[PDB]
Amino acid sequence: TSLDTENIDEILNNADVALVNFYADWCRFSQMLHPIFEEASDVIKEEFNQVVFARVDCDQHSDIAQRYRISKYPTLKLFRNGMMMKREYRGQRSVKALADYIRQQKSDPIQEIKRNIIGYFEQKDSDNYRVFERVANILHDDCAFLSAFGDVDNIIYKPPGHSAPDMVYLGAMTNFDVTYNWIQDKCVPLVREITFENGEELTEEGLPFLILFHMKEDTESLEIFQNEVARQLISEKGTINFLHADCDKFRHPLLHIQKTPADCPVIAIDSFRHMYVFGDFKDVLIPGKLKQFVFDLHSGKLHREFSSPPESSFQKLAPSEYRYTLLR
Secondary structure, eight states, X not given: OBOOTTXXXXXXXXXXXXXXXXXXXXXXXXXXXXXXXXXXXXXXXXXXXXXXXEEEETTTOHHXXXXXXXXXXXXXXXXXXXXXXEEEOOSOOSHHHHHHHHHHHHSOOOEEOOOEEEEEESOSSSHHHHHHHHHHHHXXXXXXXXXXXXXXXXXXXXXXXXXXXXXXXXXXXXXXXXXXXXXXXXXXXXXXXXXXXXHHHHHTTOOOEEEEEEOTTOOHHHHHHHHHHHHHTGGGTTTSEXXXXXXXXXXXXXXXXXXXXGGOSXXXXXXXXXXXXXXXXXXXXXXXXXXXXXXXXXXXXXXXXXXXXXXXXXXXXXXXXXXXXXXX
């Protein structure tokens, strides 16, 4: 199934789930993938519109590629109801990995009766549930979703364990954008955790990183970074990614700025060209500082002098030229 201008909108808008291979002919990795994609589609006909496999020749349909923000070849996009998923298939390039992935994506995800959302419904055969299902289908990796039917409609967000109060959804449950955004807000915290599992996605968001490195149990530090970012940098959340990392797991980034977990908590920026150190941690409390730190990245002030700064460490988490042709 080769998408084009004429047929794309139909196929995708109606597909419950669509895996789309945006490729190019001259791409070594793409050419490697073609027959793997081919076999997995054959295997995924253990279904029966439910799940469609499709491809885009990004050289034939430049208009299509530019609109799905294809940053490299081959890109594997997931679509649900013709909406593109933010997460890409970033796993092993084998028929099994692929078919498993899709199986995973088509699965559960909600259990009918850590952070927890739960939905209350008259009927699974109703608009609201459809909307809930669709959300849980997107967000199952960030949250755990549950469904209670019958007597024995509403959405409740149950946060981190006891001594933390339930939060009730007040929006329209037939309204998918709002329901989506409410749940998404409760799931995806202002300062997100960076791991190797998710690192690559985070890089492809195209923002420099502002990171707190800290000692896993040290949460005094996370919390104070948490609301300093909130209190000082909200105005700048579209310019920079607020993140936190565990020192032991990221000793290598710490090597770049001549630090060890001993020195943690440490606040740094990784711009994808260089890494920059904030200074004393407790300096976060000084009113201007954190913000100025961010400001200075953007003004070029950090670069300057200080004779050239150390390289990005997090660029290695970004998609590899040993796995993809990379587009600029």
